[PDB]
Protein backbone atom coordinates (compact mmCIF):
# COMPACT_ATOMS: atom_id res chain seq x y z
CA UNK A 1 0.00 0.00 0.00
CA UNK A 2 1.13 3.68 -0.30
CA UNK A 3 0.11 3.95 3.36
CA UNK A 4 2.79 2.15 5.29
CA UNK A 5 2.78 0.82 8.83
CA UNK A 6 4.83 3.86 9.84
CA UNK A 7 3.96 7.14 8.21
CA UNK A 8 5.23 10.62 8.76
CA UNK A 9 3.11 13.76 8.45
CA UNK A 10 3.67 17.44 8.19
CA UNK A 11 1.22 20.29 8.42
CA UNK A 12 0.82 23.95 7.84
CA UNK A 13 -2.19 25.46 9.62
CA UNK A 14 -3.02 29.10 9.42
CA UNK A 15 -5.79 31.58 9.85
CA UNK A 16 -7.41 33.73 12.47
CA UNK A 17 -9.53 33.57 15.60
CA UNK A 18 -11.49 36.68 16.69
CA UNK A 19 -9.37 38.70 14.25
CA UNK A 20 -5.97 37.39 15.54
CA UNK A 21 -3.93 36.01 12.69
CA UNK A 22 -1.51 33.11 13.18
CA UNK A 23 0.43 30.30 11.58
CA UNK A 24 1.51 26.94 12.91
CA UNK A 25 3.63 24.15 11.54
CA UNK A 26 3.66 20.55 12.70
CA UNK A 27 5.42 17.31 12.03
CA UNK A 28 4.91 13.85 13.42
CA UNK A 29 4.38 10.21 12.76
CA UNK A 30 2.05 7.38 13.47
CA UNK A 31 0.82 3.87 12.66
CA UNK A 32 -2.17 4.32 10.37
CA UNK A 33 -3.35 0.77 10.81
CA UNK A 34 -3.34 1.03 14.61
CA UNK A 35 -5.07 4.40 14.62
CA UNK A 36 -2.30 6.14 16.55
CA UNK A 37 -0.30 9.27 15.84
CA UNK A 38 1.77 11.96 17.50
CA UNK A 39 2.49 15.46 16.28
CA UNK A 40 4.88 18.15 17.42
CA UNK A 41 3.47 21.63 16.71
CA UNK A 42 4.98 25.09 16.79
CA UNK A 43 3.29 28.45 16.61
CA UNK A 44 5.49 30.33 14.08
CA UNK A 45 3.47 33.55 13.53
CA UNK A 46 1.00 35.41 15.82
CA UNK A 47 2.20 33.86 19.01
CA UNK A 48 1.58 33.80 21.87
CA UNK A 49 -1.98 32.98 20.77
CA UNK A 50 -4.57 34.92 22.79
CA UNK A 51 -6.95 31.93 22.79
CA UNK A 52 -6.90 28.30 23.82
CA UNK A 53 -4.86 26.05 21.51
CA UNK A 54 -7.50 23.39 22.16
CA UNK A 55 -9.76 25.01 19.54
CA UNK A 56 -7.12 24.24 16.90
CA UNK A 57 -6.15 20.79 18.15
CA UNK A 58 -8.76 18.85 16.18
CA UNK A 59 -7.65 20.53 12.91
CA UNK A 60 -4.15 19.12 12.86
CA UNK A 61 -5.42 13.50 10.33
CA UNK A 62 -7.89 10.93 9.04
CA UNK A 63 -5.45 8.48 7.51
CA UNK A 64 -4.64 7.34 11.08
CA UNK A 65 -7.91 5.58 11.93
CA UNK A 66 -7.88 1.90 12.73
CA UNK A 67 -10.53 0.46 10.38
CA UNK A 68 -11.69 -3.17 10.74
CA UNK A 69 -11.89 -5.66 8.00
CA UNK A 70 -15.50 -5.18 7.01
CA UNK A 71 -15.65 -1.39 7.09
CA UNK A 72 -14.14 0.13 3.92
CA UNK A 73 -11.52 2.80 4.71
CA UNK A 74 -12.38 5.81 2.57
CA UNK A 75 -9.23 7.69 3.61
CA UNK A 76 -6.60 5.08 2.92
CA UNK A 77 -8.27 4.20 -0.43
CA UNK A 78 -8.04 7.85 -1.57
CA UNK A 79 -4.32 7.81 -2.15
CA UNK A 80 -2.18 8.70 -4.00
CA UNK A 81 -4.32 11.77 -4.62
CA UNK A 82 -5.71 12.07 -1.11
CA UNK A 83 -8.75 13.86 0.27
CA UNK A 84 -10.05 17.11 1.59
CA UNK A 85 -12.19 17.96 4.60
CA UNK A 86 -14.35 21.00 5.37
CA UNK A 87 -15.79 21.62 8.76
CA UNK A 88 -17.83 24.10 10.63
CA UNK A 89 -17.66 23.90 14.46
CA UNK A 90 -20.17 25.72 16.56
CA UNK A 91 -19.57 26.31 20.25
CA UNK A 92 -22.50 26.67 22.73
CA UNK A 93 -21.44 30.19 23.67
CA UNK A 94 -21.44 31.36 20.06
CA UNK A 95 -17.88 30.78 18.73
CA UNK A 96 -17.90 29.44 15.10
CA UNK A 97 -14.85 28.05 13.35
CA UNK A 98 -14.69 27.13 9.75
CA UNK A 99 -11.81 24.91 8.54
CA UNK A 100 -10.74 23.86 5.06
CA UNK A 101 -8.11 21.13 4.83
CA UNK A 102 -6.15 19.40 2.10
CA UNK A 103 -4.43 16.03 2.57
CA UNK A 104 -1.78 15.02 0.07
CA UNK A 105 1.03 12.50 -0.15
CA UNK A 106 4.40 13.83 -1.29
CA UNK A 107 7.64 11.84 -1.33
CA UNK A 108 6.20 9.26 1.01
CA UNK A 109 5.13 11.80 3.63
CA UNK A 110 1.56 12.91 4.38
CA UNK A 111 1.22 16.66 3.84
CA UNK A 112 -1.60 18.73 5.32
CA UNK A 113 -2.66 22.31 4.61
CA UNK A 114 -5.38 23.77 6.84
CA UNK A 115 -6.99 27.18 6.91
CA UNK A 116 -9.05 28.21 9.88
CA UNK A 117 -11.31 31.10 10.65
CA UNK A 118 -12.92 31.52 14.06
CA UNK A 119 -15.31 34.31 14.98
CA UNK A 120 -17.61 35.42 17.75
CA UNK A 121 -15.94 33.72 20.65
CA UNK A 122 -16.98 35.66 23.77
CA UNK A 123 -14.09 37.88 24.89
CA UNK A 124 -14.77 36.85 28.53
CA UNK A 125 -15.23 33.14 27.74
CA UNK A 126 -13.00 30.15 28.44
CA UNK A 127 -11.58 29.99 24.90
CA UNK A 128 -10.44 33.58 24.72
CA UNK A 129 -9.31 33.58 28.37
CA UNK A 130 -7.28 30.38 27.97
CA UNK A 131 -9.21 28.48 30.65
CA UNK A 132 -9.67 25.22 28.82
CA UNK A 133 -8.25 21.78 29.71
CA UNK A 134 -8.54 19.61 26.63
CA UNK A 135 -11.17 17.57 24.89
CA UNK A 136 -13.26 14.74 26.30
CA UNK A 137 -13.10 11.54 24.27
CA UNK A 138 -15.86 11.39 21.65
CA UNK A 139 -17.48 9.34 18.93
CA UNK A 140 -17.97 10.74 15.41
CA UNK A 141 -20.73 9.28 13.30
CA UNK A 142 -19.69 8.71 9.67
CA UNK A 143 -22.34 8.69 6.92
CA UNK A 144 -21.94 7.93 3.23
CA UNK A 145 -22.87 10.93 1.08
CA UNK A 146 -22.65 10.94 -2.73
CA UNK A 147 -19.19 9.50 -3.04
CA UNK A 148 -17.80 11.20 0.07
CA UNK A 149 -18.49 11.06 3.78
CA UNK A 150 -20.21 13.29 6.30
CA UNK A 151 -18.94 13.17 9.84
CA UNK A 152 -21.06 14.38 12.72
CA UNK A 153 -19.63 15.15 16.11
CA UNK A 154 -20.82 16.58 19.41
CA UNK A 155 -17.70 17.22 21.56
CA UNK A 156 -17.05 18.61 25.05
CA UNK A 157 -14.25 21.00 25.74
CA UNK A 158 -13.24 20.89 29.41
CA UNK A 159 -13.06 24.24 31.16
CA UNK A 160 -11.52 25.31 34.49
CA UNK A 161 -13.72 24.93 37.51
CA UNK A 162 -15.33 21.70 36.40
CA UNK A 163 -17.20 22.90 33.34
CA UNK A 164 -17.52 22.04 29.69
CA UNK A 165 -18.37 23.89 26.50
CA UNK A 166 -20.32 21.76 24.08
CA UNK A 167 -19.63 22.14 20.35
CA UNK A 168 -20.91 20.41 17.30
CA UNK A 169 -19.92 20.10 13.77
CA UNK A 170 -20.46 18.40 10.51
CA UNK A 171 -17.39 17.55 8.41
CA UNK A 172 -17.53 16.93 4.69
CA UNK A 173 -14.87 14.51 3.54
CA UNK A 174 -14.20 14.40 -0.22
CA UNK A 175 -11.89 12.26 -2.31
CA UNK A 176 -9.39 13.85 -4.72
CA UNK A 177 -9.06 10.67 -6.76
CA UNK A 178 -9.04 11.26 -10.46
CA UNK A 179 -8.14 7.65 -11.50
CA UNK A 180 -9.26 4.44 -9.77
CA UNK A 181 -11.92 3.26 -7.44
CA UNK A 182 -13.20 3.76 -3.90
CA UNK A 183 -15.27 1.26 -2.08
CA UNK A 184 -17.75 3.13 0.03
CA UNK A 185 -18.41 2.20 3.65
CA UNK A 186 -21.74 2.13 5.25
CA UNK A 187 -22.69 4.20 8.31
CA UNK A 188 -20.09 3.69 11.05
CA UNK A 189 -18.54 5.50 13.95
CA UNK A 190 -15.03 6.65 14.88
CA UNK A 191 -13.98 6.82 18.54
CA UNK A 192 -11.38 9.47 19.27
CA UNK A 193 -9.12 10.33 22.19
CA UNK A 194 -6.98 13.37 21.74
CA UNK A 195 -4.36 13.96 24.46
CA UNK A 196 -2.03 16.84 25.08
CA UNK A 197 1.34 15.35 25.95
CA UNK A 198 3.57 18.52 26.22
CA UNK A 199 3.15 22.12 26.15
CA UNK A 200 5.21 25.17 26.72
CA UNK A 201 4.08 27.89 29.07
CA UNK A 202 2.21 29.96 26.47
CA UNK A 203 1.40 26.97 24.14
CA UNK A 204 4.00 28.10 21.54
CA UNK A 205 5.00 24.41 21.45
CA UNK A 206 2.50 21.59 21.80
CA UNK A 207 2.81 17.82 21.45
CA UNK A 208 -0.41 15.88 21.05
CA UNK A 209 -1.43 12.39 20.29
CA UNK A 210 -4.56 10.73 19.05
CA UNK A 211 -6.04 7.33 19.07
CA UNK A 212 -8.87 6.79 16.58
CA UNK A 213 -10.75 3.54 15.99
CA UNK A 214 -13.64 2.82 13.61
CA UNK A 215 -16.50 0.68 14.75
CA UNK A 216 -19.99 -0.36 13.62
Author numbering: 3 to 62, 66 to 221
Please share text taken word for word from the publication where this structure appeared.
GECIs are prominent tools to monitor [Ca2+] in defined cells and intra-cellular compartments. To create a red GECI, we selected the red fluorescent protein (FP) mRuby (an engineered variant of eqFP611 exhibiting high thermodynamic stability and monomericity) and replaced cpEGFP with circularly permuted mRuby in the GCaMP3 scaffold. To aid our protein engineering efforts, we sought to solve the crystal structures of mRuby, RCaMP, and R-GECO1. High-resolution crystal structures of mRuby in several states, as well as a structure of a Ca2+-loaded RCaMP variant, aided optimization of the red GECI scaffold to useful performance levels.
Structural information on the parent protein of mRuby, eqFP611 (86% sequence identity with mRuby), has been published, however, no protein structure of mRuby was available at the time of initial RCaMP engineering, hampering optimization efforts. It has previously been shown that pH can have a large effect on chromophore conformation in red FPs; therefore we determined the crystal structure of mRuby at two different pHs: 4.5 and 8.5. The structure of mRuby at pH 8.5 shows a trans-isomer of the red 2-(iminomethyl)-4-(4-hydroxybenzylidene)-imidazol-5-one chromophore, while the structure at pH 4.5 shows a mixture of ~60% trans and ~40% cis. The large difference in pH had no notable effect on overall mRuby protein structure (RMSD = 0.13 Å for 208 Cα atoms). Similar pH-dependent cis-trans conformational changes also occur in the related FP eqFP578 (70% sequence identity with mRuby). Crystal structures of mRuby at low and high pH revealed a cis-trans chromophore isomerization in acidic environments. In contrast with the chromophore in the structure of mRuby crystallized at pH 8.5, the RCaMP structure (crystallized at pH 7.5) shows the (4-hydroxybenzylidene)-imidazol-5-one moiety of the chromophore to be a cis-isomer. Superimposition of both mRuby structures and the cp-mRuby domain of RCaMP demonstrates a slight (~1 Å) shift of the RCaMP chromophore (red structure in Figure 3C) relative to both isomers of the mRuby chromophore (cyan in Figure 3C).
